[PDB]
């Protein structure tokens, strides 16, 4: 049977929302042994929705300038972080990741509608794909920022951010940013 990293089951995870059920591809058809697939998911529009979510997390972690080519190191980081997730919670770490992503994505956002000079932003809904993209980017950026100058390793802060985002506590940077954008949009309407 297909397992992530040789050990992680993928038939046990569940998607809570129907909104993101077609955009997080982890369940049955799209599970793989390693995140590193090197496939063309930026070839055409919406193709990256079929990319597995763990590879998306790996790709958005090597995003920053010095680590801009290193993916093997990043998939090592993801492997160690998922190991720490399984050690702490005991749940399947993929479900923890999915809960973090569905809990971290903003539901509406403010937009400049008008011209350059009209600073009244209108609150508009967000695409579910944009919601997933923003959730991925905020989780990676919070893990990046929390582990810049400290003894805590990147994978450790990454796992801790995933725990706070899936649990929903106000310790994750991502959920703080989500609340900020959402309340700014609710102020605009």
């Amino acid at each position: 049977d297909i397992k992530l990293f040789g050990k992680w089951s993928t038939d046990d995870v569940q998607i809570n929302d129907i909104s993101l059920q077609d955009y997080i591809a982890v369940k049955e058809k799209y599970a793989k042994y390693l995140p590193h697939s090197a496939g063309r998911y930026a070839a055409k529009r919406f193709r990256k929705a079929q990319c597995p979510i763990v590879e998306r997390l790996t790709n958005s972690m090597m995003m920053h300038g010095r680590n801009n080519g290193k993916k093997l190191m990043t998939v090592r980081i993801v492997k160690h972080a998922f190991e720490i997730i399984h050690l702490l919670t005991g749940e399947n770490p993929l479900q923890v990741l999915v809960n973090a992503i569905i809990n971290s994505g903003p539901r509406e956002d403010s937009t400049r509608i008008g011209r350059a000079g009209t600073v009244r932003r209108q609150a508009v809904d967000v695409s579910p794909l944009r919601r997933v993209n923003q959730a991925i980017w905020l989780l990676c950026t919070g893990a990046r920022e929390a582990a810049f100058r400290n003894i805590k390793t990147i994978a450790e802060c990454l796992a801790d951010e995933l725990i706070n985002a899936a649990k929903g506590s106000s310790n994750s940077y991502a959920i703080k940013k989500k609340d900020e954008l959402e309340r700014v949009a609710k102020s605009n309407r």
């Binding site: 929302d17 129907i18 909104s19 077609d22 529009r45 919406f46 539901r107 509406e108 956002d109 937009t111 400049r112 509608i113 008008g114 011209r115 350059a116 009209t118 209108q122 508009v124 809904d125 967000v126 695409s127 579910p128 794909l129 944009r130 919601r131 993209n133 309407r189």
Partner: protein, 61 residues
């Protein structure tokens, strides 16, 4: 409360810089109440959304 939405058909790209998308909205609450809405990001016909306020109507006329 939270009312989830469906995309019937995409009207077009609106906004100052074409960063908003005007779409037609179907509800999964067994109602045929289809309303126009504007969204941010990439959407297609068949997307399923999460609308926090269903009372809001888009820029109509």
């Amino acid at each position: 409360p939270i009312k989830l939405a469906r995309v019937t058909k995409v009207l077009g790209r609106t906004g100052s810089q074409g960063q908003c998308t005007q779409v037609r909205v179907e509800f999964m609450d067994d109602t045929s109440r289809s309303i126009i809405r504007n969204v941010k990001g990439p959407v297609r016909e068949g997307d399923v959304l999460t609308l926090l306020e269903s009372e809001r109507e888009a820029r109509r006329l």
